[PDB]
Amino acid sequence: MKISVSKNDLENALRYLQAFLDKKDASSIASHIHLEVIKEKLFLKASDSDIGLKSYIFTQSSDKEGVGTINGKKFLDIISCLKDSNIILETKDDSLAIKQNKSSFKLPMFDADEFPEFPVIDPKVSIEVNAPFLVDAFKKIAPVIEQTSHKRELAGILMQFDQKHQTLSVVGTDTKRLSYTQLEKISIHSTEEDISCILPKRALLEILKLFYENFSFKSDGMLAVIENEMHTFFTKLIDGNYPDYQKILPKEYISSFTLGKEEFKESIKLCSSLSSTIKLTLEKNNALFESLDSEHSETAKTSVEIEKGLDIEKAFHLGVNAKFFLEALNALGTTQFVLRCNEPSSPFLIQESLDEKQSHLNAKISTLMMPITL
Amino acid sequence: MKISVSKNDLENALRYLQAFLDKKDASSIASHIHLEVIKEKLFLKASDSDIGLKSYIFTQSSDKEGVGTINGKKFLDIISCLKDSNIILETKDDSLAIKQNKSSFKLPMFDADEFPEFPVIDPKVSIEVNAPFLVDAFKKIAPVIEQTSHKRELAGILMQFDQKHQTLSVVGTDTKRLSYTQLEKISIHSTEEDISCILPKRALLEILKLFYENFSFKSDGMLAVIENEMHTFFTKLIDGNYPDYQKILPKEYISSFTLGKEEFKESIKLCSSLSSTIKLTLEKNNALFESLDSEHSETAKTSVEIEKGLDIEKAFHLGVNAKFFLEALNALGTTQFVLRCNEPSSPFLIQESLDHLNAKISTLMMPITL
Ligand SMILES: O=C(O)c1cc(-c2ccc(F)cc2F)ccc1O
Ligand SMILES: O=C(O)c1cc(-c2ccc(F)cc2F)ccc1O
């Protein structure tokens, strides 16, 4: 192996690959990145059976093609200490030499056959993603997903494909809040009419680092593979049947109040200094907030005026988890939000203002939430 | 007590007091700020026996004088979440009320009499600091002082006052490196011709957050008290004798090299990617750097051209600790540095080239063998 590459190209590829390495035992191949030069490209990959990344960068010059490995952490540390000019990488019998002007480094390579095979699938489902809407939905939904949840399938995010109606539904929950969206007019190529892929939280968080728009998503009902111009990412799916979210959603809502998002954030944040739960009191022209499960002797109260009068005969009292209410508001792209309610003891919905209106670039995430009693 | 104060003034004051609170036990008065209104001022204190800060802010309107307390962490959290308009603070029995228009809060107070009284000293030494030299010395030397030092007097920074010749010496060490400076022409008032104060690392760090120039330093040999227009700070001193740092320093050096600071920083940083220690080779027109305690078959090499020839016939070899060498260079204000050596196994010195507003820190360092 012998090549020249751009320092910036190489450093960037190495940063992304860090999260796929077990870095603590430097003597194990699990701490190494597999290297392969083929034609005018350097391929770098770090993976195991469950999750992995294969990246590539263009060579500036190419002299010998071949394979090798190198400790990924030490490789990034070295490159980040160099100038922004080309770097010469060259093997010397199970050792990689790294050269930039007057600086030179040797690191040992391991057997490249000890690296696991990068998997390849025959897809049952595939889409092209040319806009930010899907990763937006992933980013907005992620905070409600618990990796340690009891129900196996709730520890990841749900992607439910309806190729008949051309919708991709994206759903996450911890049983206390459920956040969802239904992305429209998605060109879904599938052998099945309805197929479900559950991505583990771990993999979801890596997808947010690696992709934005202009990538493909493919799956065979076992693995998910995602690819853009630079990267090929894969993860194993979570096996099982994610519960039907549409049967959990209430049919109708008695009341639907249009309220100020930032005003509600401020007030809830303010009251949550002393308590994880809050008592919300909605009147015709006011919203009152009080700390609820604070230690005794501690109180925090505030209110806010509602100019555009709510349809409230009396006074609606709702106990809410502060953090969960905030995160639901944080997932909304509008300046106002709709709070849809039945009784104080039953689930309530938080969603954007004009949620039925169609969007292109971003997802609209709605959140159903169990209230606190009293 | 009752007082209407500015949100930002109160917020800012509370942020500074956080480091002086033991926040983990909220049932302890160590987690509380002492509040007192007197005339046009709200005084806020956070302290124990060992360290403390007293601050104040102003009111413009009528108030009521009195005392009270409040959990300092909870108070900051509340005030940081409020709007940028006036905040009314008022005691109501054993509770502090906070009011900003539609927002209102009550928090339990503890007995203000349990609050440790803020110390007043009869100073045996005092200085007026009207320039950043001292805090500059503190900042530059602080990294060599380990707070977890098992030898007690080395856990703090030395301030050695020489009344007779108007010099303040400031010194830190961990036994592997010793960093020092002699601050000339300082108006020292003191009841002895020589006196020494050792400030704990803890306190040294807080001083850097609070003070810069235009402050007084005072001590009675037991507490240090530092004061500006805004704040009064104190700390307990570390008791015992700081070792004679002056007898440690070599009298003469066989070799003295004037070298580039940033180039050495870069080359050492580069080699320290694979090692904690480095082998330095100085030749007439070259400086070579190699990783030394790197693992089997791991190597990092680089070199730098020295345009102005060094004064050596045979190449000089020196093993160094990378991090200690870097921090010694980080303490220098000049673009070049003087490295002074005897044998490769003898202590070596780093200092500025060509040694009002900045202190000059020299660092003496034990080398690594081979
Ligand atoms: O099994 C469960 O108890 C359960 C509960 C919910 C759920 C119900 C009501 C609500 F307001 C929010 C939720 F996340 C969502 C999913 C789920 O599996
Ligand atoms: O305990 C010690 O032996 C000891 C050693 C030093 C010291 C000696 C030489 C040197 F190059 C650096 C040092 F910090 C400085 C202070 C000190 O107390």
Encode chain B in three state secondary structure: CEEEECHHHHHHHHHHHHHHCCCCCCCCHHHEEEEEEECCEEEEEEECCCEEEEEEEECCCCCECEEEEEEHHHHHHHHHCCCCCCEEEEEECCEEEEEECCEEEEEECCCHHHCCCCCCCCCCEEEEECCCHHHHHHHHHHHHCCCCCCCHHHHEEEEEEECCCCEEEEEEECCCEEEEEEECCCCEEECCCEEEEEEEHHHHHHHHHHCCCCEEEEECCCEEEEECCCCEEEEECCCCCCCCHHHHCCCCCCEEEEEEHHHHHHHHHHHCCCCCEEEEEECCCEEEEEECCCCCCCEEEEEEECCCCCCCCCCEEEEEEHHHHHHHHHCCCCCEEEEEECCCCCCEEEEECCCCCCCCCEEEECCECC
Distance CA(B261)–CA(B360), nearest Å, equals: 15
Side chain identity, residue A175: T
Distance CA(A244)–CA(B98), nearest Å, equals: 47
Choose the closest CB to B102 out of A105, A273, A302.
Answer: A302
Distance CA(A49)–CA(A203), nearest Å, equals: 13
Q: For the purposes of burial, counting CB atoms within 10 Å of the CB of B60, is it exposed (0-12), middle (13-18) or buried (19 or more)?
A: exposed
Give B365's Cβ-side CA count (13 Å radius). Answer: 26
Chain A residues inside the 8 Å CB shell of B300 = 78, 103-105
Among chain A residues, CA nearest to B96: A298
Domains of chain B from N-terminus onward: 1-244 (no CATH), 245-370 (3.10.150.10)
Query: Which has the closest alpha carbon to B222: B234, B233, B211?
Result: B234
Residues A81, B273: C-beta atoms closer than 8 Å: yes
Residues 6+ away with beta carbon under 8 Å from A137: A170, A181, A183, A363, A365
**Assigned token pair, B43:** 């005084």
Q: A201-210 and A133-141 helices cross at what angle (nearest 10)?
A: 140
Distance CA(A52)–CA(A73), nearest Å, equals: 16
Per-residue burial over B142-178, b = 16 or more CB atoms within 10 Å of its CB, e = otherwise: bbbbbeebeeebbbbbbbbbbeeeeebbbbbbbeebb
Distance CA(B136)–CA(A129), nearest Å, equals: 55
Distance CA(B218)–CA(A253), nearest Å, equals: 70
Choose the closest CB to A81 out of B95, B270, B297.
Answer: B270
Q: Which residues pair with A183 in a beta bridge?
A: A168
Residues 6+ away with beta carbon under 8 Å from B72: B14, B17, B18, B21, B23, B31, B32, B33, B46
The nearest CA of chain A is from the CA of B351 a distance in Å of 25
Give B181's Cβ-side CA count (13 Å radius). Answer: 23
The nearest CA of chain A is from the CA of B90 a distance in Å of 14
Residues 6+ away with beta carbon under 8 Å from A227: A215, A216, A218, A233
**Relative to the alpha carbon of B240, which ligand is closest?**
2
Distance CA(A353)–CA(A199), nearest Å, equals: 29
The nearest CA of chain B is from the CA of A109 a distance in Å of 10
Q: Please spell the DSSP secondary structure of A93-126, one letter per residue.
A: SSEEEEEETTEEEEEE---GGGSPPPP----SEE
Q: B201-210 and B133-141 helices cross at what angle (nearest 10)?
A: 140
Confirm if B20 and B206 have CB atoms less than 8 A apart: yes
Q: Which helix (H) or strand (E) holds A348?
A: strand A348-352
Q: Cα(first)–Cα(last) distance of chain B, in Å? A: 69
Confirm if A58 and A40 have CB atoms less than 8 A apart: yes
Q: What is the number of CB-based contacts under 8 A between chain A and chain B?
A: 76
Q: CA A31, A37, A38, A39: dihedral to nearest 10 degrees?
A: 150
How far away, in angstroms, is B323 Cα from ligand 2 center?
Answer: 17
Query: Which has the closest alpha carbon to B184: B334, B359, B352, B364?
Result: B359
Confirm if B285 and B307 have CB atoms less than 8 A apart: yes
User: Does the CB of B92 have a partner CB in chain A at under 8 Å?
Assistant: no
Distance CA(A242)–CA(A160), nearest Å, equals: 9
Chain B residues inside the 8 Å CB shell of A107 = 297-298
The nearest CA of chain B is from the CA of A10 a distance in Å of 17
In the block, tokens 């111009």 appear at: A229
Listed in sequence order, the DSSP H helices in chain A are 7-17, 72-80, 133-141, 201-210, 261-271, 322-330
Chain A residues inside the 8 Å CB shell of B108 = 297-298
Q: A322-330 and A261-271 helices cross at what angle (nearest 10)?
A: 150
Residues B81, A107: C-beta atoms closer than 8 Å: no
Q: For the purposes of burial, counting CB atoms within 10 Å of the CB of B85, is it exposed (0-12), middle (13-18) or buried (19 or more)?
A: exposed
Distance CA(B277)–CA(B294), nearest Å, equals: 8
Choose the closest CB to B273 out of A77, A108, A302.
Answer: A77
Residues 6+ away with beta carbon under 8 Å from A251: none
DSSP code of residue A275: -
How far away, in angstroms, is B345 Cα from ligand 2 center?
Answer: 14
Q: How far is the CA of A79 from the CAs of A8, A14, A85, A87, B261, in angstroms?
A: 9, 9, 11, 9, 22
Q: 10 Å Cβ neighbour count for A303?
A: 17
Distance CA(B337)–CA(B256), nearest Å, equals: 10
Distance CA(A142)–CA(A150), nearest Å, equals: 17
Closest residue CA from atom 17 of ligand 1 = A175
- Cα A344 to its chain centre, rounded Å, is 32
Which of B152, B157, B177, B178 is the best mutation target for the ligand 2 pocket, counting ligand atoms within 8 Å of the beta carbon and taking the most? B178
How far away, in angstroms, is A226 Cα from ligand 1 center?
Answer: 29
**Assigned token pair, B197:** 């104060």
Query: Which has the closest alpha carbon to A330: A178, A138, A140, A172?
Result: A140
How far away, in angstroms, is B177 Cα from ligand 2 center?
Answer: 7
Residues A270, B74: C-beta atoms closer than 8 Å: no
Distance CA(A21)–CA(A224), nearest Å, equals: 20
- Cα B98 to its chain centre, rounded Å, is 35
User: Does the CB of A297 have a partner CB in chain B at under 8 Å?
Assistant: yes
User: Does the CB of A374 have a partner CB in chain B at under 8 Å?
Assistant: no
Q: Which residues pair with B317 in a beta bridge?
A: B281
Tell me which of B85, B263, B281, B301 to substitute to probe the interface with A (most A C-beta atoms closer than 10 Å).
B301
Query: Which has the closest alpha carbon to B367: B321, B317, B335, B307?
Result: B321
User: Does the CB of A274 have a partner CB in chain B at under 8 Å?
Assistant: yes
Query: Which has the closest alpha carbon to A58: A119, A117, A5?
Result: A5
Confirm if A157 and A202 have CB atoms less than 8 A apart: no
Residues A74, B269: C-beta atoms closer than 8 Å: no
Q: For the purposes of burial, counting CB atoms within 10 Å of the CB of B370, is it exposed (0-12), middle (13-18) or buried (19 or more)?
A: exposed
How far away, in angstroms, is A245 Cα from ligand 1 center?
Answer: 8
Q: Please spell the DSSP secondary structure of A155-178, one letter per residue.
A: GEEEEEEETTTTEEEEEEE-SSEE
Chain A residues inside the 8 Å CB shell of B81 = 266, 269-270, 273
Handedness of CA B316, B321, B322, B324 (dihedral sign): negative
Residues 6+ away with beta carbon under 8 Å from B313: none
Confirm if A179 and A367 have CB atoms less than 8 A apart: yes
**Assigned token pair, A341:** 């309610």
Q: Cα(first)–Cα(last) distance of chain A, in Å? A: 69
Q: Which atom of ligand 1 is nearest to the CA of A368?
A: 11
Q: 10 Å Cβ neighbour count for A316?
A: 19
Side chain identity, residue B155: A
Among chain B residues, CA nearest to A272: B78
Among chain A residues, CA nearest to B104: A301
Q: Which residues pair with A162 in a beta bridge?
A: A167, A194
Give B353's Cβ-side CA count (13 Å radius). Answer: 9
Confirm if B322 and B275 have CB atoms less than 8 A apart: yes
Distance CA(B186)–CA(B180), nearest Å, equals: 16
**Relative to the alpha carbon of A152, which ligand is closest?**
1
Confirm if A338 and A350 have CB atoms less than 8 A apart: yes
